[PDB]
Paper text:
Protein phosphatase 5 (PP5) is an evolutionary conserved serine/threonine phosphatase. Its dephosphorylation activity modulates a diverse set of cellular factors including protein kinases and the microtubule-associated tau protein involved in neurodegenerative disorders. The phosphatase activity of PP5 is regulated in a complex activation mechanism by its N-terminal Hsp90-interacting tetratricopeptide repeat (TPR) domain and its C-terminal α-helix, called αJ-helix. The C-terminal αJ-helix binds to the N-terminal TPR domain of PP5 and locks the enzyme in a latent state.
For the most promising compound crystallographic comparisons of the apo PP5 and the PP5–P5SA-2 complex indicate a relaxation of the auto-inhibited state of PP5. By contrast, a tilting of the TPR domain up to 10° is observed in the ligand complexed structure (RMSD: 0.84 Å) accompanied by a rearrangement of the αJ helix. These structural domain reorganizations are manifested in a reduction in the crystal lattice constant c by 15 Å. Inspecting the omit maps for both αJ helices ranging from Asn491 to Gly497 or to Met498 respectively, a considerable displacement of the Cα-atom of Gly497 by 6.5 Å is observed. Comparing the structures of the human and rat apo PP5 proteins, we observe a similar positioning of the αJ-helix in both, whereas the TPR domain of the human PP5 is even further tilted relative to the rat PP5–P5SA-2 structure. This tilting of the domains and the changes in the αJ helix could well be the reason for the higher activity in the presence of P5SA-2. The ligand P5SA-2 itself cannot be modelled in the F0-Fc electron density map. However comparison of the two structures, PP5 apo and the PP5–P5SA-2 complex, assigns a potential binding site of the ligand at the interface between the TPR and the phosphatase domain. The visible parts of the ligand structure imply interactions with the phosphatase domain at amino acids Glu428, Val429, Lys430, Ala431, Glu435, Met455 and Asn457. The modulate character of the P5SA-2 interaction would be in agreement with the NMR data of this complex, which suggested that parts of the ligand are not complexed by the protein. Substitution of the involved amino acids M455-G456-N457 to A455-G456-A457 and E428-V429-K430 to A428-A429-A430 resulted in loss of the stimulatory potential of the compound P5SA-2, implying that this pocket is indeed involved in regulatory processes, which are altered by the compound.
Numbering used by the authors: 23 to 149, 159 to 497
Write the structure that this text describes.
């Protein structure tokens, strides 16, 4: 009985979903849909599982299919509005929250989401540089503050070590210090090329980490397990420092501090989560407003805009958060020429560097995330050959073992956030490269305990569904 088979497969998918095994959830929903392609609940649950795995494009299409089947399926509208929020389609989301708060005026949840949506809409409408309406010198550190302070405005190794300790005890760096770090670090970054270039001599090493997503206690574990940064232990943090994790302020100010301390050996590349559309939904903007001000947040936003987009080691390995391009013929010079100081556009090379994913089949598809592309091994081979490169290192996707090697070895994924969001139970890893030998060496590690704060504790409700 085809329909009762579809239904058993959907029940298994629900089971997979609840166990946080979205990849199988998706697969069993997909098979359910294969047997009965005309049920709204199926499309709606698969839309939610695509949302959980940040596949906004696919969540959007499934939500739309669910709504086209049943105009009264309320879930369909929330999950459609979530996808659109994450895609920067704020007005589209509001239309759906409206259609809901309409079909029941009473709903507590409906109006809260509508209002939260309108507030972002209203702000973005509204939307000189923030530093100029700040008077950092005039601020005063209260006598009774006993946490870390800069040594005459300067970051040092002793400041970094006390900062790390202070944060471990869940305490807050005085706002004056936070401001100074931000201003200097803006100054450093705004000097960098869009493409950072590093030469590693025969005897030198470099560590590449992937996403860390505000997992502060895991970030300290990287440093214990692999050493503090210094001029003989350089690091690249390949984006997505913040969001989801509820210690994002602690992660980003530690990283920025180390960038000031070892500016030529501690490198930070922009990820898709160093952007407004992500930060307003996924916790960072809320965490910074809770702990500091809306003005601090606007400053973080403007610094993120100067983060370089890619890094090239010895002209042979190319590192970016996302992946390769929607278009053929993009060169390394083209990347160097990108005007990066902005939010990323909806498409184009800057967008692809932050957002794209590899796919196993040849060619290009519109991406499952609803922005940029998926690119096959023939895309990767042509770009490497055209540019005299050996392979790429990228991050952006959660991996069960903390890394993955795709495209015949030409596309490497590294991911540095173990037990991601307290739920995935994945290993994390970092890479060592060596000047004499640029083949990636992987080191895996597991999650470490942290205080009682939930992931997304500071985020609005727009992307917390189910
Ligand atoms: Mg990412
Ligand atoms: Mg990420």
């Amino acid at each position: 009985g085809t329909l009762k088979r579809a239904e058993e497969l959907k029940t298994q998918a629900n089971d997979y979903f609840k166990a946080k095994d979205y990849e199988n959830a998706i697969k069993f929903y997909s098979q359910a849909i294969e047997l009965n392609p005309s049920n709204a609940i199926y499309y709606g649950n698969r839309s939610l599982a695509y949302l959980r795995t940040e596949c906004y494009g696919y969540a959007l299409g499934d939500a739309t299919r669910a709504i086209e089947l049943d105009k009264k399926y309320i879930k369909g509208y929330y999950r459609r509005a979530a996808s659109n929020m994450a895609l920067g389609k704020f007005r589209a989301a509001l239309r759906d929250y409206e259609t809901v708060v309409k079909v029941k005026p009473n709903d507590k949840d409906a109006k809260m989401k509508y209002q939260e949506c309108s507030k972002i809409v209203k702000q973005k409408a509204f939307e000189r540089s923030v530093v100029d309406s700040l008077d950092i010198e005039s601020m005063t550190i209260e006598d009774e503050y006993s946490g870390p302070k800069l040594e005459d405005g300067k970051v040092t190794i002793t400041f970094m070590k006390d900062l790390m300790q202070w944060y471990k005890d869940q305490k807050k760096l005085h706002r004056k210090c936070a401001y100074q770090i931000l201003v200097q670090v803006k100054e450093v970054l705004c000097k960098l090329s869009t493409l950072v270039e590093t030469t590693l001599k025969e005897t030198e090493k470099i560590t590449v980490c992937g996403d860390t997503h505000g997992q502060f206690y895991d970030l300290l574990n990287i440093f214990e397990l692999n050493g503090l940064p210094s001029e003989t232990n350089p690091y690249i943090f390949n984006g997505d420092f913040v969001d989801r994790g509820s210690f994002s302020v602690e992660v980003i100010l530690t990283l920025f501090g180390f960038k000031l301390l070892y500016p030529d050996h501690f490198h930070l590349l922009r990820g898709n989560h160093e952007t407004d559309n992500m930060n307003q939904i996924y916790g960072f903007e809320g965490e910074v407003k809770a702990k500091y001000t809306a003005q601090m947040y606007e400053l973080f936003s403007e610094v993120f805009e100067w983060l370089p987009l890619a890094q090239c080691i010895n002209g042979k390995v190319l590192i970016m958060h996302g992946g390769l391009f929607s278009e053929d013929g993009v060169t390394l010079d083209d990347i160097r020429k990108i005007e990066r100081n902005r939010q990323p556009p909806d498409s184009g090379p800057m967008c692809d560097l932050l957002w794209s994913d590899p796919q196993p089949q040849n060619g290009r598809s519109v991406s499952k995330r609803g922005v940029s592309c998926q690119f096959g091994p023939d895309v990767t081979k042509a770009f490497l050959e055209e540019n005299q490169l050996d392979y790429i290192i990228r991050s952006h996707e959660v991996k069960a073992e903390g890394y993955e090697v795709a495209h015949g070895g030409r596309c490497v994924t590294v991911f540095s956030a173990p037990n991601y969001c307290d739920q995935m139970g994945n290993k994390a890893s970092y890479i060592h490269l060596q000047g004499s030998d640029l083949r990636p060496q992987f080191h895996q590690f597991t999650a470490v305990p942290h205080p009682n704060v939930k992931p997304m504790a500071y985020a609005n409700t727009l992307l917390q569904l189910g």
